[PDB]
Amino acid sequence: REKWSSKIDFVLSVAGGFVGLGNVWRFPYLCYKNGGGAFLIPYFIFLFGSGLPVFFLEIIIGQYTSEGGITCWEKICPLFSGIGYASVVIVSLLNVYYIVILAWATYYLFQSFQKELPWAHCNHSWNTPHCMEDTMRKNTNFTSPVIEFWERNVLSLSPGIDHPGSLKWDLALCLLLVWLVCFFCIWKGVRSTGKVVYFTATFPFAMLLVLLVRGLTLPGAGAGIKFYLYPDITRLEDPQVWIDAGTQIFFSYAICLGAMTSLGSYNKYKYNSYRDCMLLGCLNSGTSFVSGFAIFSILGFMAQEQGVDIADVAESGPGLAFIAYPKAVTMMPLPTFWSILFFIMLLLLGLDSQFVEVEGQITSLVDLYPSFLRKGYRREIFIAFVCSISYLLGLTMVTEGGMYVFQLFDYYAASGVCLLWVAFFECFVIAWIYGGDNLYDGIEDMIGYRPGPWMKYSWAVITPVLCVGCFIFSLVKYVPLTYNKTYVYPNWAIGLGWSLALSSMLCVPLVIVIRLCQ
Numbered sequence: 001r002e003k004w005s006s007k008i009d010f011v012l013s014v015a016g017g018f019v020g021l022g023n024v025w026r027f028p029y030l031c032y033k034n035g036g037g038a039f040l041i042p043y044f045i046f047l048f049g050s051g052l053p054v055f056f057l058e059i060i061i062g063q064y065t066s067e068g069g070i071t072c073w074e075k076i077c078p079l080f081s082g083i084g085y086a087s088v089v090i091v092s093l094l095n096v097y098y099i100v101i102l103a104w105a106t107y108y109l110f111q112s113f114q115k116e117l118p119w120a121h122c123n124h125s126w127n128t129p130h131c132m133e134d135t136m137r138k139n140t141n142f143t144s145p146v147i148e149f150w151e152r153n154v155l156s157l158s159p160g161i162d163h164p165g166s167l168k169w170d171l172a173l174c175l176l177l178v179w180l181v182c183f184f185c186i187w188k189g190v191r192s193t194g195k196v197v198y199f200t201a202t203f204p205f206a207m208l209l210v211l212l213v214r215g216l217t218l219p220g221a222g223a224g225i226k227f228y229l230y231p232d233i234t235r236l237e238d239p240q241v242w243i244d245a246g247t248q249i250f251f252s253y254a255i256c257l258g259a260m261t262s263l264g265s266y267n268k269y270k271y272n273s274y275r276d277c278m279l280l281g282c283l284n285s286g287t288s289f290v291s292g293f294a295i296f297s298i299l300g301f302m303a304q305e306q307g308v309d310i311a312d313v314a315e316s317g318p319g320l321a322f323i324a325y326p327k328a329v330t331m332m333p334l335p336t337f338w339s340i341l342f343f344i345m346l347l348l349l350g351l352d353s354q355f356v357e358v359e360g361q362i363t364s365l366v367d368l369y370p371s372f373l374r375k376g377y378r379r380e381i382f383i384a385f386v387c388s389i390s391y392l393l394g395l396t397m398v399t400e401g402g403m404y405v406f407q408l409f410d411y412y413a414a415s416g417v418c419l420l421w422v423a424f425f426e427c428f429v430i431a432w433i434y435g436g437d438n439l440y441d442g443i444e445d446m447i448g449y450r451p452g453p454w455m456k457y458s459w460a461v462i463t464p465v466l467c468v469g470c471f472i473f474s475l476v477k478y479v480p481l482t483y484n485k486t487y488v489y490p491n492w493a494i495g496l497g498w499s500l501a502l503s504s505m506l507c508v509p510l511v512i513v514i515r516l517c518q
């Protein structure tokens with residue numbers, strides 16, 4: 001009972017949905033976890049095999065169904081709604097740890113207003129005697145001031161997950177503030193996701209261009225470019241690199257999250273030609289490809305400054321951005337204003353992504369039961385309830401020692417086997433039950449043109465093989481998850497993470513057996 005008011009609002013909403021902290025922070029992190037450029041070889045193959053095809057697929061399904069993401073697949077076939085349920089579970093478990101990064105980002109923002117940058121000096125109440133300045137570091141028991149800051153000021157590092165500590169209040173208050181900024185932005189101005197943002201949309205691109213120019217100008221970038229580009233065929237046999245590359249492809253474009261299907265489902269039949277899908281895919285691929293240039297150039301500068309190997313300069317964990325950016329902005333003149341602008345830009349990206357996902361999930365939940373809900377004051381109950389539940393549940397990652405739970409969430413929840421499972425089932429059903437020929441006939445009149453033979457040999461052959469092979473190789477060749485290559489997780493922690501992944505995985509067989517029973 002709702003549709004877009006402008007033809008450009010849908011495009012802006014979709015665009016804002018996929019550009020953000022996934023292709024500027026996690027992408028360099030995942031490409032840095034595995035040495036060399038071996039990340040790139042599966043990147044392009046998985047892109048042209050599953051990314052753009054599915055990216056068009058749920059869009060066209062949503063526009064044909066004009067209904068919620070949980071029920072869009074229901075319209076296609078009565079079974080396989082486990083895809084939608086797994087998507088909603090994945091997004092619900094993804095928001096929890098996707099807002100904590102914004103929480104400490106805004107903590108950095110508030111801590112950046114000071115006259116002198118806290119991470120540019122060595123003497124603080126949270127610094128060990130093993131504190132040497134990186135400028136004179138080159139002048140095996142020494143670290144850099146930013147490394148000490150990241151692990152002893154923003155969040156104190158407990159010796160392990162087995163020993164949780166005391167709940168920190170600064171990060172909890174910052175994350176509550178983020179939730180308050182997100183709540184008022186939802187129950188007021190629902191159209192603001194694409195209405196007033198027309199002039200602010202160019203701001204992140206301009207800031208990214210400035211960052212790219214500054215990073216390219218920054219010395220010691222040749223090593224970073226070589227590491228980013230040139231591949232390493234030596235270590236392709238283990239499935240770690242393929243798994244992370246495929247999951248990054250499926251992460252940046254937000255496949256299997258039930259968001260793009262709803263965004264396209266807002267529009268009614270006979271929508272414009274979907275060349276915009278291939279346009280937006282190319283736009284996001286280019287943004288991700290160019291951000292890595294600046295990121296790896298600044299990591300190359302850090303490597304040439306500290307004097308250690310490129311693979312060991314950072315923590316190889318989710319703190320890559322917050323250890324790379326400060327070292328780049330400390331030398332570049334006028335640190336304070338540029339730091340403020342940079343962190344507000346990060347908040348903009350994270351926020352837009354956060355409320356888009358929240359809108360999608362809330363739309364799915366309200367479409368699940370429409371009898372009990374109506375557009376009006378009644379939305380307050382189910383917005384406040386979900387916000388409070390998420391705030392309380394995400395309080396276990398801001399405590400000292402909550403970093404480990406965050407890393408477990410990053411590795412298992414909303415990534416890895418669950419995404420491949422859901423995508424493989426989507427392609428399998430759409431190709432071998434409904435039929436690609438039916439979709440071509442349905443879209444011929446809508447588009448006005450017959451697409452080339454590239455949606456039938458990519459929905460039925462290319463994607464299922466690259467999903468099942470990676471899944472089987474991951475099962476056969478197993479390596480326990482490690483943090484910073486040093487810590488060894490307890491067995492019950494690995495069991496908890498595997499249960500986290502299996503909760504999303506098991507959605508499909510459960511609904512299949514339930515529908516088979518009756």
Ligand SMILES: CC(C)CCC[C@@H](C)[C@H]1CC[C@H]2[C@@H]3CC=C4C[C@@H](OC(=O)CCC(=O)O)CC[C@]4(C)[C@H]3CC[C@]12C
Pocket residue numbers: 088089092093368389390
């Ligand atoms: C932030 C946390 C709480 C998220 C946890 C995962 C949720 C996405 C799951 C957990 C329980 C699920 C619900 C469990 C039961 C139902 C009832 C079901 O329809 C029924 O009423 C029939 C079955 C019944 O009576 O429960 C529709 C899906 C729904 C709302 C599920 C929607 C998805 C939910 C909320």
Ligand SMILES: CC(C)CCC[C@@H](C)[C@H]1CC[C@H]2[C@@H]3CC=C4C[C@@H](OC(=O)CCC(=O)O)CC[C@]4(C)[C@H]3CC[C@]12C
Pocket residue numbers: 085089502503504507510511514
């Ligand atoms: C329990 C642990 C191991 C996993 C974490 C919980 C959720 C990830 C899963 C587990 C069982 C799932 C439920 C199993 C069965 C159903 C019924 C099915 O809904 C219906 O078809 C409603 C009835 C109907 O319309 O016929 C799909 C949603 C739901 C509530 C599922 C929602 C998601 C749940 C709660």
Ligand SMILES: *[C@@H]1O[C@H](CO)[C@@H](O)[C@H](O)[C@H]1NC(C)=O
Pocket residue numbers: 123124125
């Ligand atoms: C660190 O050095 C500064 C300047 O040398 C000094 O003022 C300060 O007391 C020292 N200790 C701490 C904890 O800052």
Ligand SMILES: *[C@@H]1O[C@H](CO)[C@@H](O)[C@H](O)[C@H]1NC(C)=O
Pocket residue numbers: 135136139
């Ligand atoms: C070692 O000391 C100075 C002190 O700032 C440092 O900047 C420089 O790298 C070194 N000086 C030399 C090698 O003359």
Ligand SMILES: *[C@@H]1O[C@H](CO)[C@@H](O)[C@H](O)[C@H]1NC(C)=O
Pocket residue numbers: 140141
């Ligand atoms: C310095 O590094 C050595 C490594 O051989 C280590 O044994 C020592 O504990 C470290 N610290 C000091 C103060 O020597």
Ligand SMILES: O=S(=O)(O)C1CCNCC1
Pocket residue numbers: 016017018019020021022023251252253254257353
């Ligand atoms: O790539 S992002 O836009 O930042 C985000 C989008 C939603 N799925 C996780 C990544």
Ligand SMILES: [Cl-]
Pocket residue numbers: 023027248249252253284285288
């Ligand atoms: Cl990407």
Ligand code: NA
Pocket residue numbers: 015016017018019020021349350352353
């Ligand atoms: Na975004």
